[PDB]
Amino acid sequence: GIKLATGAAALDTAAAIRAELAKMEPFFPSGLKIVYPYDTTPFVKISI
Amino acid sequence: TDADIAQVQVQNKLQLAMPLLPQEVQQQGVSVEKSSSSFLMVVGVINTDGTMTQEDISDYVAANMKDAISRTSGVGDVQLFGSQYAMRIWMNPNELNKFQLTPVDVITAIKAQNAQVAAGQLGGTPPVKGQQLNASIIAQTRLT
Amino acid sequence: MPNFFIDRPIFAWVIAIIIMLAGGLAILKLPVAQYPTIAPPAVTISASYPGADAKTVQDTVTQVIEQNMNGIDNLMYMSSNSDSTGTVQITLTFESGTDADIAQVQVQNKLQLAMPLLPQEVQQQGVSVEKSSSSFLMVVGVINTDGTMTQEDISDYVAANMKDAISRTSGVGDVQLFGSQYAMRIWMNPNELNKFQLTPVDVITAIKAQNAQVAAGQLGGTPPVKGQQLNASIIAQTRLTSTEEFGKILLKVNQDGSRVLLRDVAKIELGGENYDIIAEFNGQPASGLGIKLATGAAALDTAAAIRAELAKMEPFFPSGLKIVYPYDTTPFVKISIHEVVKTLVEAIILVFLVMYLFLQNFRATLIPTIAVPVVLLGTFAVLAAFGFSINTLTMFGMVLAIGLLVDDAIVVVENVERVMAEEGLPPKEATRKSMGQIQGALVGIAMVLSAVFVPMAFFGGSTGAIYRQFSITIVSAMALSVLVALILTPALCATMLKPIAKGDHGEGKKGFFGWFNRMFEKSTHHYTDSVGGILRSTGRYLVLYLIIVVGMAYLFVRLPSSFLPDEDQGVFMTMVQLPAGATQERTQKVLNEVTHYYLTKEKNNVESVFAVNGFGFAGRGQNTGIAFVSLKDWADRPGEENKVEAITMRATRAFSQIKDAMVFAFNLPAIVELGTATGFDFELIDQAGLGHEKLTQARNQLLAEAAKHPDMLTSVRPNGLEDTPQFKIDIDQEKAQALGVSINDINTTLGAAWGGSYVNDFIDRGRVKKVYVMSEAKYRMLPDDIGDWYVRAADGQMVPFSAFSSSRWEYGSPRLERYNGLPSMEILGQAAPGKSTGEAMELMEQLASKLPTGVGYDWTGMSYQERLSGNQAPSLYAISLIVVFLCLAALYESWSIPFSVMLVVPLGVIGALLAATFRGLTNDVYFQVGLLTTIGLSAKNAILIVEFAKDLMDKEGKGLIEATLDAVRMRLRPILMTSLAFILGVMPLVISTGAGSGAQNAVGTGVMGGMVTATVLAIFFVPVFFVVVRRRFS
Amino acid sequence: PGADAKTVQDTVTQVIEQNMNGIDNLMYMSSNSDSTGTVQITLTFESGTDADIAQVQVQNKLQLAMPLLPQEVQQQGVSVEKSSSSFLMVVGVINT
Amino acid sequence: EDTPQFKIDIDQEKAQALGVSINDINTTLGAAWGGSYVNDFIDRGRVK
Amino acid sequence: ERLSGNQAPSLYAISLIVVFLCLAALYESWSIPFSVMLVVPLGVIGAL
Amino acid sequence: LGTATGFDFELIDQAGLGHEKLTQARNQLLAEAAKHPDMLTSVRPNGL
Amino acid sequence: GSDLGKKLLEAARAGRDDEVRILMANGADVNAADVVGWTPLHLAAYWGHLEIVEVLLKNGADVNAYDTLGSTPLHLAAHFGHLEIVEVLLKNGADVNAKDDNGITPLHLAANRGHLEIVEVLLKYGADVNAQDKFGKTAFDISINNGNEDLAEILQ
Ligand SMILES: CCCCCCCCCCCCCCCCCCCC(=O)O[C@H](COC(=O)CCCCCCCCCCCCCC)COP(=O)(O)OCCN
Ligand SMILES: CCCCCCCCCCCCCCCCCCCC(=O)O[C@H](COC(=O)CCCCCCCCCCCCCC)COP(=O)(O)OCCN
Ligand SMILES: CC(=O)O[C@H]1C[C@@]2(C)[C@@H](C[C@@H](O)[C@H]3[C@@]4(C)CC[C@@H](O)[C@@H](C)[C@@H]4CC[C@@]32C)/C1=C(\CCC=C(C)C)C(=O)O
Ligand SMILES: CCCCCCCCCCCCO[C@@H]1O[C@H](CO)[C@@H](O[C@H]2O[C@H](CO)[C@@H](O)[C@H](O)[C@H]2O)[C@H](O)[C@H]1O
Ligand SMILES: CCCCCCCCCCCCO[C@@H]1O[C@H](CO)[C@@H](O[C@H]2O[C@H](CO)[C@@H](O)[C@H](O)[C@H]2O)[C@H](O)[C@H]1O
Ligand SMILES: CCCCCCCCCCCCO[C@@H]1O[C@H](CO)[C@@H](O[C@H]2O[C@H](CO)[C@@H](O)[C@H](O)[C@H]2O)[C@H](O)[C@H]1O
Ligand SMILES: CCCCCCCCCCCCO[C@@H]1O[C@H](CO)[C@@H](O[C@H]2O[C@H](CO)[C@@H](O)[C@H](O)[C@H]2O)[C@H](O)[C@H]1O
Ligand SMILES: CCCCCCCCCCCCO[C@@H]1O[C@H](CO)[C@@H](O[C@H]2O[C@H](CO)[C@@H](O)[C@H](O)[C@H]2O)[C@H](O)[C@H]1O
Ligand SMILES: CCCCCCCCCC(=O)OC[C@H](CO)OC(=O)CCCCCCCCC
Ligand SMILES: CCCCCCCCCC[N+](C)(C)[O-]
Ligand SMILES: CCCCCCCCCC[N+](C)(C)[O-]
Ligand SMILES: CCCCCCCCCCCC
Ligand SMILES: CCCCCCCCCC
Ligand SMILES: CCCCCCCC
Ligand SMILES: CCCCCCCC
Ligand SMILES: [Cl-]
Residues of D in contact with B16 (CB under 8 A): 77, 79
Report which residue type is found at A12: D
C762 CA to centre of own chain: 40
Phi, psi of C958 (to 5 degrees): -85, 165
CA separation for the pair A28, F18 (Å, rounded):
72
How far is H66 from H80, CA to CA, in rounded Å? Answer: 17
- Looking only at Cα atoms, what is the longest distance across chain C? 128
Q: Is G16 exposed, middle or buried (0-12, 13-18, 19+ CB in 10 A)?
A: exposed
CA distance linking residue H152 with residue H139, whole number of Å? 9
Contact H65, H42 (CB under 8 A): yes
Give the CA distances from residue E12 to residues C186, D3, E33, E34, H77, in Å, rounded to whole numbers and listed in that order: 21, 21, 20, 21, 58
How far apart are alpha carbons D25 and C115 in whole angstroms? 31
- At the topology level, CATH places domain C571-674 in Alpha-Beta Plaits (3.30.70)
Residues 6 or more apart whose Cβ sits within 8 Å of residue C74: B73, C94, C95, C98, C103
What is the identity of the amino acid at C270?
L
Please give the backbone phi and psi of residue B123, each rounded to the nearest 5 degrees, phi first: 60, 40
F29 min Cα distance to partner chain C (Å): 7
- Strand B135-138 to strand C724-731: parallel, antiparallel, or no bridges (unpaired)? parallel
The secondary structure of residue A25, as a DSSP letter, is G
Instruction: Give dist(CA E19, CA C164) in Å, integer.
Output: 47
With beta carbons less than 8 A apart as the criterion, state whether H62 and H27 touch: no
> Dihedrals φ, ψ of C531, to 5°?
-70, -40
3-state class (DSSP) for residue C172: strand
Query: Which of B1, B5, B35, B41 to probe the A interface (max A CBs under 10 A)?
Result: B41
Helices (H) and strands (E) counted in chain E, each on its own, are: 2, 3
C positions 842-881 inside 8 Å of A (CB)? 854, 856
Q: Alpha-carbon distance C691 to C824, whole Å?
A: 10
Alpha-carbon distance of B20 to D76, in angstroms, equals: 8
Distance CA C13, CA C9 (A): 6
Q: DSSP labels for C632-650?
A: PPTTTS-SGGGSHHHHHHH
Length of chain C: 1034
CB C289 within 8 A of CB C139: yes
Give percent helix, percent strand, percent coil of chain G, each to the nearest 5: 35, 0, 65
The answer to whether C807 contacts H46, with C-beta atoms less than 8 Å apart, is: no
Is D7 in contact with D73 (CB distance < 8 Å)? no
CA distance E3 to chain D (A): 10
Subunits adjacent to chain C (3 or more Cβ pairs under 8 Å)? A, B, D, E, F, H
Distance CA B38, CA A3 (A): 6
Burial category of C741 from C-beta neighbours within 10 Å (exposed 0-12, middle 13-18, buried 19 and up): buried
**Is-contact B12 D80, C-beta < 8 A?**
yes
* Spatial distance between the Cα atoms of C957 and C227, rounded to a whole number of angstroms: 117
Which SS3 state, helix, strand or coil, does residue C326 take? Answer: strand
Report CA torsion sign: C305, C309, C312, C317. Answer: negative
Residue of C nearest to B125 (CA): C275
Interacting residues of C948 by C-beta distance below 8 A, sequence separation 6+: C437, C963, C966, C967, C970, C971
Choose from C55, C57, C583, C801 for mutation: most chain B CBs within 10 A. Answer: C583
According to the 3-state scheme, what is the secondary structure of chain B?
CCHHHHHHHHHHHHHHHHHHCCHHHHHCCCCCCCECCCCCEEEEEEECCCCCCHHHHHHHHHHHCHHHHHHCCCEEEECCCCCCCCCCCCCCHHHHHHCCCCHHHHHHHHHHHCCCCEEEEECCCCCCCCCCCCEEEECCCCCC
Compute the C-alpha angle B133/B136/B140, nearest 5°.
140
Q: How far is B110 from chain C (nearest CA, A)?
A: 12
Ligand 1 neighbour C878 (Cβ under 6 A): no
Q: Please indicate if any CB of chain G lies within 8 Å of the CB of E44.
A: yes
**Could D22 and C167 be called an inter-chain contact, meaning their C-beta atoms sit closer than 8 Å?**
yes
First to last CA, chain G: 25
B65 close to A (CB below 8 A): yes
Nearest to C1015 by CA among C519, C442, C532, C407: C407
Work out the burial of residue D84: count CB atoms within 10 Å of its CB; fewer than 13 is exposed, 13-18 middle, 19 or more buried.
exposed
- Cα separation of H118 and H107, whole Å? 8
Between C and E, how many CB-CB pairs are < 8 A? Answer: 60
Q: Say which residues have a Cβ less than 8 Å from residue C752's Cβ, sequence separation at least 6.
A: C188, C200, C201, C203, C204, C773, C774
> Would you call C289 helix, strand, or coil by DSSP?
strand
Beta strands at C768-775 and C183-188: parallel, antiparallel or unpaired:
parallel
Distance CA C704, CA C701 (A): 5
CA C656 to chain centroid, in Å, comes to: 30
Strands ordered across the beta sheet of A2-4:
A32-39, B41-47, A2-4, B75-78
Q: What are phi and psi of C323, to 5 degrees?
A: -90, 140
How many Cβ atoms are within 10 Å of C829's Cβ, its own excluded? 21
Cβ-Cβ contacts under 8 Å, H69 against chain C: 783, 807-809
Cβ atoms of C685 and C855 within 8 Å: the answer is yes
Whole-angstrom Cα distance, residue C809 to residue B137?
10
Coil/strand/helix, residue C158:
helix
Residue B76: which of A4, A14, A30 has the nearest Cβ?
A: A4
Method by which this entry was solved: X-ray
Q: What is the pairing mode between strands C724-731 and C138-144?
A: unpaired
Nearest Cα residue to C417 out of C314, C511, C493, C318 = C493
**Peptide bond between residue C31 and the one before it cis (omega within 30 degrees of 0):** no
Hey, how many other C-beta atoms are within 10 angstroms of the C-beta on C742? Answer: 16
Q: Which of E5, H112, H141 is nearest to C216 (CA)?
A: E5
Which amino acid residue places its CA nearest to atom 43 of ligand 1? F27
**Which DSSP symbol is given to C922?**
-
Cβ within 8 Å, pair D67-C173: no
Phi, psi of C992 (to 5 degrees): -40, 130
Amino acid at C100: A
Q: Does B10 touch chain A (CB under 8 A)?
A: no
Residues C774, C758 contacting (CB under 8 angstroms): no
Q: CA-to-CA distance for H64 and C60, rounded, in angstroms?
A: 39
SS3 (DSSP) at C88: strand
Angle at which helices C644-655 and C584-600 cross, to 10° = 130
- What is the length of chain F? 48
Helix/strand/coil for C629: strand
Burial F6-28 (b: 16+ CB within 10 A, else e): eeeeeeeeeeeeeebbebbbeee
3-state SS class at C675: coil
Q: Which helix (H) or strand (E) holds C157?
A: helix C151-157
| Residue B82 buriedness (CB in 10 A; 0-12 / 13-18 / 19+) | middle
What CATH architecture does domain C184-271 belong to? Answer: 2-Layer Sandwich (3.30)
Got the DSSP string for C460-526?
-HHHHHHHHHHHHHHHHHHHHHHHHHHHHHHHHHHHHPPP--TT--SSS--HHHHHHHHHHHHHHHH
Closest Cα partner for C995 from C646, C643, C666? C643
C718 beta partners: C827
The ligand that comes nearest to the alpha carbon of residue C500 is: 16
**Which of H 15-54 lie inside 8 A of B, CB atoms?**
35-36
Instruction: Give partners of D (≥3 CB pairs < 8 A).
Output: B, C, E
Buried b (16+ CB within 10 A) or exposed e, D85-96: eeeeeeeeeeee
Beta-carbon separation of F25 and C17 below 8 A: no
What phi-psi label fits residue C859: left (phi over 0), alpha (psi between -120 and 50 degrees) or beta? beta
CB C235 within 8 A of CB C215: no
The CATH classification of domain C724-812, taken from the options 1.20.1090.10, 3.30.200.20, 3.40.30.10, 3.30.2090.10: 3.30.2090.10
Please name which of H125, H122, H153, H127 lies closest in space to residue H140, comparing C-alpha atoms: H153
For residue C755, count CB atoms less than 10 angstroms from its CB and return exposed for 0-12, middle for 13-18, buried for 19 or more.
buried
What are chain B's partners, defined as 3 or more CB pairs within 8 angstroms? Answer: A, C, D, H
- Helix axis angle for C538-558 and C997-1032, nearest 10°, is 150
Q: How far apart are CA D72 and CA C17, in angstroms?
A: 63
* Residue C988: closest CA among C513, C341, C304: C341
User: Element (H or E) spanning C576, and its range?
Assistant: strand C571-577
Which candidate, C280, C310, C381, places its Cα nearest to that of C15? C381
Dist. CA C577–CA C625, nearest whole Å: 7
CA angle C496, C497, C502 (to 5 degrees): 155
Q: Which amino acid is at D26?
A: L
Tell me the resolution in Å. 2.8
DSSP state of C457: G
How far from C943 is each of A1, C443, C906, C947, C967, CA to CA, in Å? Answer: 61, 11, 16, 6, 11
Residues whose CB falls within 8 Å of the CB of residue C990, separated by 6 or more in sequence, listed in order: C1000, C1001, C1004, C1005, C1008
Instruction: Give the integer Cα–Cα distance in Å for C181 and D18.
Output: 14
**Residue B114 C-alpha, separation from nearest chain H C-alpha, in angstroms:** 16
State the SS3 of C967-1004: HHHHHHHHHHHHHHHHHHHCHHHHHCCCCCHHHHHHHH
**How close does chain G come to E40, measured CA to CA in Å?**
17
CATH class as words, domain H1-156? mainly alpha
Nearest one of C914, C938, C922, C924 to C1020, comparing CA atoms: C938
Identify the sign of the CA torsion C371, C377, C381, C384: positive
Q: Could you tell me whether strands C75-83 and C42-48 are parallel, antiparallel, or unpaired per DSSP bridges?
A: unpaired
- DSSP structure class, residue C786: G
Peptide bond just before C223 cis, omega within 30 deg: yes
DSSP letters for C206-268: HHHHHSS----EEETPSS--TT----EEEE------SHHHHHT-EEEE-TTS-EEEGGGTEEE
Backbone angles phi, psi at B52, to 5 degrees: -125, 135
Query: Which residue type is seen at C604?
Result: N
Per-residue HEC secondary structure of C336-401 comes to HHHHHHHHHHHHHHHHHHHHHHHHCCHHHHHHHHHHHHHHHHHHHHHHHHCCCCECHHHHHHHHHH
Distances (CA, A) of C761 to C185, C265, C749, D69, F30: 12, 21, 20, 9, 74
Alpha carbon distances (Å) from C632 to C224, C569, C603, E7 = 74, 11, 10, 60
Alpha-helix residue ranges (DSSP H) falling in C668-724: 692-707
The whole-angstrom distance between residue C310's C-alpha and the CA centroid of its chain comes to 27
Whether C700 has its CB under 8 Å from any CB of chain H: the answer is: yes
CA angle, H110 as apex, H107 and H113 as ends, to 5°?
Answer: 145
- The answer to whether the CB of C687 is under 6 A from ligand 15 is no
DSSP string, D23-63: -TTEEEEEEEE-TTS-EEEEEEE-TT--HHHHHHHHHHHHH
